[PDB]
Amino acid sequence: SLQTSFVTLDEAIKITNRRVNAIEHVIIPRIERTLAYIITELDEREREE
Amino acid sequence: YLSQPRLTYKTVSGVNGPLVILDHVKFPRYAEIVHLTLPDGTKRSGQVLEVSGSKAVVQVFEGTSGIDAKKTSCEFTGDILRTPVSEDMLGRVFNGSGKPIDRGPVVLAEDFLDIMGQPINPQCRIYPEEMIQTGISAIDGMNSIARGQKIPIFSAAGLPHNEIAAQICRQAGLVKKENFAIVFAAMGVNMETARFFKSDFEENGSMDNVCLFLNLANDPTIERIITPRLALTTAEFLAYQCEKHVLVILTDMSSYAEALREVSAAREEVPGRRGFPGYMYTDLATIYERAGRVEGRNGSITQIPILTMPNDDITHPIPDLTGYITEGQIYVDRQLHNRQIYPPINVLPSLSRLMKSAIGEGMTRKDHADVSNQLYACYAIGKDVQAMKAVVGEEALTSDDLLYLEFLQKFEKNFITQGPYENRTVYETLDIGWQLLRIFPKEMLKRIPQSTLSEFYPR
Amino acid sequence: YLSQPRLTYKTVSGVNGPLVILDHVKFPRYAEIVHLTLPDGTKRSGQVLEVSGSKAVVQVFEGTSGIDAKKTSCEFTGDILRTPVSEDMLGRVFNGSGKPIDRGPVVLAEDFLDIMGQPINPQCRIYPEEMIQTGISAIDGMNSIARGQKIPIFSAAGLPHNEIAAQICRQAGLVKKENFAIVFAAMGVNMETARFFKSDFEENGSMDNVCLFLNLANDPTIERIITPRLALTTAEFLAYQCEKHVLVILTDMSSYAEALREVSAAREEVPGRRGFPGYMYTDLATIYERAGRVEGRNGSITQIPILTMPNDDITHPIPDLTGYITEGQIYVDRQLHNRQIYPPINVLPSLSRLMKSAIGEGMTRKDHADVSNQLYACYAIGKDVQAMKAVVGEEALTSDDLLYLEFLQKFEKNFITQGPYENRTVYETLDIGWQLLRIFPKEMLKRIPQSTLSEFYPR
Amino acid sequence: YLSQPRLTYKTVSGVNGPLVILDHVKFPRYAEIVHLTLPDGTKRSGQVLEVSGSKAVVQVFEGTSGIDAKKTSCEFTGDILRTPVSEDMLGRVFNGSGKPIDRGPVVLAEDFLDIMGQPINPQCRIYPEEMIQTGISAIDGMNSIARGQKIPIFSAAGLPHNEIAAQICRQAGLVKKENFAIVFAAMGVNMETARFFKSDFEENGSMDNVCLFLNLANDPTIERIITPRLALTTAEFLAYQCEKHVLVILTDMSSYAEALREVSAAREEVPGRRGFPGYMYTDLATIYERAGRVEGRNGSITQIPILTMPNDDITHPIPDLTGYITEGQIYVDRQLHNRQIYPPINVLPSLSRLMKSAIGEGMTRKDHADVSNQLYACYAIGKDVQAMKAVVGEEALTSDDLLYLEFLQKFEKNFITQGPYENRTVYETLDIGWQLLRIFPKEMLKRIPQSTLSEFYPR
Amino acid sequence: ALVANTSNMPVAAREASIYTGITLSEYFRDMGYHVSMMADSTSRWAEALREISGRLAEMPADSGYPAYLGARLASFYERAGRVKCLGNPEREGSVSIVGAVSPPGGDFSDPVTSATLGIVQVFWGLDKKLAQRKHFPSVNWLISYSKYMRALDE
């Protein structure tokens, strides 16, 4: 059971860490770049007004 | 010449920011230069940017602080800023206004050229077909420099773009297996930066072939948009009238853009992006396009308009509009610098728009183009593999992916890393290219034809 | 009868873009019309935008090129552009100003109407009810259209909004348990589209009841400001005096809005969002609201205007102000088009305000309202499931989420996807709706009452 | 005194919205107060905003309707707006203009002060020391208000920022280990809330020490601008001339900011960032910084500005420009409100930069600083454990985690949740803290020195 | 044949260059030839319009560009097309227009790219991230489209 429990755990850790890594390295950076893009473009519209 | 006496006016109508507006002016001329004296004897100059009837708008270079309304005395030279040029300007140091600052005399002119210049007739312009050997593998291999090409270094504050430019000045030769006259416009920089280049030029033993134009951070911001024109105007004299090969380096062009933006705001011109004038591109082209060879004359002008990218934003109008005008860029970044890699040149976002003609059979080696293209593919893929592995882990990679990580790691330390005084030939650079390409089996080198792999890959 | 000779002026003050400014004019009338004779004999027309004292600003429809400030003769009509209208305008093609382009004669003035519009007393307005069976499941099922409605089609550049509008025109009709006249206003339409509609009307034998007003992309951009008012003025004559049912198609209100912007800028008016005049709302309301039924008449006007959405957004002032005026939309999307779905209509951001009353027992089917709501909610959920799947993977969904994903895929393939030459009835559309709903167990169809489910669901 | 007869003018050049433009005015002052008399005998007040020669431009406080250019008379006072101040006005209720609305007499002045005042000479500013307890545990035992600091309450629209503000007025006072007054100004308050403040202050006996200014949402927008200046003008009189401590609460500074934007538009100034004047920064500092202790006097002024965050975004210029020039923040949340916790103040994002000096032996109690730090850590940990519990479950928690959950639940229920009519002094708040801290064994209270634990922890 | 109006030449000439080129194209179209002109900029022409509009003190529209930007592009591109020529000899010709656009930053949101996409029937979008990998031609192939697919199916 120890070994079998350790089995279901090594896969669960790698799967959870992979999802966490993607949020940190893919999804949020992309949200931050989008937000910074929006902020810049909004100031550009303010200027022409 | 102009034999008629010039007129002097005390008719200033008013002052609004950097612009002094005169009235009662006889037949105002557009883009003529006016000399003005302040009540305390200070002398300043400016240019008429607008005429209407008896009125004229003068932009004062030194500034409008202390300009009076009743005692200010102005005189109109009667012409545009034509500047004295001579061959013996090499070895002299000038300020951004064209005056000497090396305790030598004023320029003893051979002629007077219009600082605005003239566009070169595209029918007589001759396409560049000669390569300059920069000695930097990151450039000579994957982004070659032609003689007459326009290649700025895109950099960022704190990066050693001044060291790279200095290095290029000393070890820039030809691949025809030569002394370039260097014109260095130091604008918007501190004393230490200007002294760095001046000292390096003397250390290189080449100072007699170097003409400096300095406009430091504590100098007027309006002169900062004629300094490039002064440097290039001299370059045109040397290159197209005296058939001297000239290398013109313009320091952080962003100080030019900021000086221009200030003028644009002052004159309430139509903005484009980030507050810069909608004509910023046209103005930059006026500066940048003063380059290249001309058919029938043995001179050339090569430019390196290095610029700092605000906040490392590659889409900022300054690098953006420059990228549209110049034949590509070398581009350095912080990801290489933060790992003590020199030169910190990132090949992926870089390009040389004349490389396709300056390399290959009769120029360097026939496999040059093939090696470069495959190295680009392998380098970019290795970066893609890191982007994946950062999430999936090394265990998720196969042998096809580890090869690109091995390539990427060996590529950066063997190909890019050199050192400030490492001068490699173009042939050595290609040989190194092959040493990295031989990391992969022939079947994976898909950018290179078998007519090339069969000859070079086995070695 | 205005039997008073007209004044003609040469007292031109100046010309600025599309605007001609006249002076020394006797008792200028607002929104009057001026005929301009150019020095070379060219005749053009324009409408007064404002008057002040002895000055007037004239909007020149055909364009201002060639007008001088000395010889151009300006004839003031003394009246407002009241346009000739006739019941026999059907079977004719006019240009953007209402003049023949089809080699026919000038329309004979059976009567004249002021194109500005005569406001209809809301007390006598008759609420629309009868459903138009368009043949398109995305419309007849969910966002049904009542006769007399105002439902524009939003799209971005490159999408097949011209095909959908053409399909509606030839498939238009009522839900049965005789046909429409077409008034087609082309504003800034390219020649390829212009022949697309003209040929489709001819091939289907519709021209007997079609009146075209063609202002093409290569025609004057000021003229198109009245073009839509000329089209609706004819529609109002035919619908409210000649007891016809008229379907009015406006090919692009965006090129119209741009034409207003050009004029608004020309007179240096204070803009609102994105440079458009602050009164865009009114200029659109006075066109869109020329629709519906009136007490005592049997005819009607139904409008289906088309609007190209700049940058693929739906917050741009043009579609934003239209959405506030019209009674829903179709909204043709791009994500469906890229997947080769036709009609690529996105049901979620699109509504029809009159749908809740134009359906149900006595008009379509007892369950129409219940089927629509359930399908809409199912689609909306499916999209939220798709949004999750893109992050968590197909292996992280529960059984219910898979039912919505299966619905989503089959919904677009079997329900929305139709083809341009196949029409389906409202009853056939609902039967397909049920086929999609029967994917779910009855317990999950929470927006359909149990009585409705027991009647239809098990069939 | 002036003792100069006033001039009344009937010469009016024109009227434009809220502005009346006068002519032939003798030596007009900027910011001069004038009184208008309309043909119907109606009187209005106004203030001169621009004086260009003899062309005085006055903004009318009330509406300008009914004003003509032939009969309306304008009486000039010859002076600017100076507020009558006294000690007796404490216990009175005034409107934005400084007039009584409590059926009492007009203030019998002891002096007249310019409501704009002057900045306090920094050389005589005394760093904040003792504490002013509010009676609300969430901001006495966690982020106390030093006797001289300026700490804002940021809230989203819809949260009970007005109920807390009223509670502070009823409960606030000195620690008491007769010289304390509160000046309360509400800008842009609606009728229902204005009644709340007036009635709640009167009924609970607090009015004797409160000076209340009510500027209603439908009152003149210019009066809303002076309202906070009148409140501070009184506060400065009471505090610095009458040797007492004044708490000034400025409620709904966001409504002030909107009134300020309206005044800017009246001057035809080009809007700055997000529509607000470019001088919004200094205007807020002008109001906020008229507070603190002064050398040689025993009085003090504190401020608790209260600001609604538009769209609940702390980045918005209003809370951003405020916080940038204030010392910490209280921060009222929404989650705590929806959970039916009153007061809904979130202790984790709040900060009082002067708390280090406000509390301690000789000012509150020896253990104050230690109890606060340990409670903050315990709440932060409890929230962290609660987040863990939601993932791993109750059975996966150890004993220490359960203690943090017990603290979290009882902390919010006993310490933060208070009720609007329970006044908890600083010593009761600390005793409640210890009751929660005695949940933990001594060894887990890592931030409280052993000497403090041995003195206070037991019993 | 080719027309040179380089970046460092008078900005006003950029408008004349664009119209001169297409006028030449029509001339040969009328003679029964198939012409395929290409203007390598477009944005530089619209830029000239912006600079002149500024000097004129005109009221700008989106991002500083003249309100009539769309009018100029629409009337320019509509001069393209396969035609039956005027003239008794019954010639057939065409003018194609392949025009580059230079959006700042590669962001396909500027008034010139936006207006252009509403006019042109073929969209050859390029992706800077493909060019960095020397994946030439750097065609995105996800955002590009051609509305002539059905026309050429025959």
UniProtKB/TrEMBL annotation, chain A:
<protein>
    <recommendedName>
        <fullName>V-type proton ATPase subunit D</fullName>
    </recommendedName>
</protein>
<comment type="similarity">
    <text>Belongs to the V-ATPase D subunit family.</text>
</comment>
<comment type="function">
    <text>Subunit of the V1 complex of vacuolar(H+)-ATPase (V-ATPase), a multisubunit enzyme composed of a peripheral complex (V1) that hydrolyzes ATP and a membrane integral complex (V0) that translocates protons. V-ATPase is responsible for acidifying and maintaining the pH of intracellular compartments and in some cell types, is targeted to the plasma membrane, where it is responsible for acidifying the extracellular environment. May play a role in cilium biogenesis through regulation of the transport and the localization of proteins to the cilium.</text>
</comment>
<comment type="subunit">
    <text>V-ATPase is a heteromultimeric enzyme made up of two complexes: the ATP-hydrolytic V1 complex and the proton translocation V0 complex. The V1 complex consists of three catalytic AB heterodimers that form a heterohexamer, three peripheral stalks each consisting of EG heterodimers, one central rotor including subunits D and F, and the regulatory subunits C and H. The proton translocation complex V0 consists of the proton transport subunit a, a ring of proteolipid subunits c9c'', rotary subunit d, subunits e and f, and the accessory subunits ATP6AP1/Ac45 and ATP6AP2/PRR. Interacts with SNX10.</text>
</comment>
Automatic annotation (TrEMBL), chain E:
<protein>
    <recommendedName>
        <fullName>V-type proton ATPase catalytic subunit A</fullName>
    </recommendedName>
</protein>
<comment type="function">
    <text>Catalytic subunit of the V1 complex of vacuolar(H+)-ATPase (V-ATPase), a multisubunit enzyme composed of a peripheral complex (V1) that hydrolyzes ATP and a membrane integral complex (V0) that translocates protons. V-ATPase is responsible for acidifying and maintaining the pH of intracellular compartments and in some cell types, is targeted to the plasma membrane, where it is responsible for acidifying the extracellular environment.</text>
</comment>
<comment type="similarity">
    <text>Belongs to the ATPase alpha/beta chains family.</text>
</comment>
<comment type="subunit">
    <text>V-ATPase is a heteromultimeric enzyme made up of two complexes: the ATP-hydrolytic V1 complex and the proton translocation V0 complex. The V1 complex consists of three catalytic AB heterodimers that form a heterohexamer, three peripheral stalks each consisting of EG heterodimers, one central rotor including subunits D and F, and the regulatory subunits C and H. The proton translocation complex V0 consists of the proton transport subunit a, a ring of proteolipid subunits c9c'', rotary subunit d, subunits e and f, and the accessory subunits ATP6AP1/Ac45 and ATP6AP2/PRR.</text>
</comment>
<feature type="binding site">
    <location>
        <position position="136"/>
    </location>
    <ligand>
        <name>ADP</name>
    </ligand>
</feature>
<feature type="domain" description="ATPase F1/V1/A1 complex alpha/beta subunit nucleotide-binding">
    <location>
        <begin position="1"/>
        <end position="146"/>
    </location>
</feature>
<feature type="binding site">
    <location>
        <position position="40"/>
    </location>
    <ligand>
        <name>Mg(2+) 2</name>
    </ligand>
</feature>
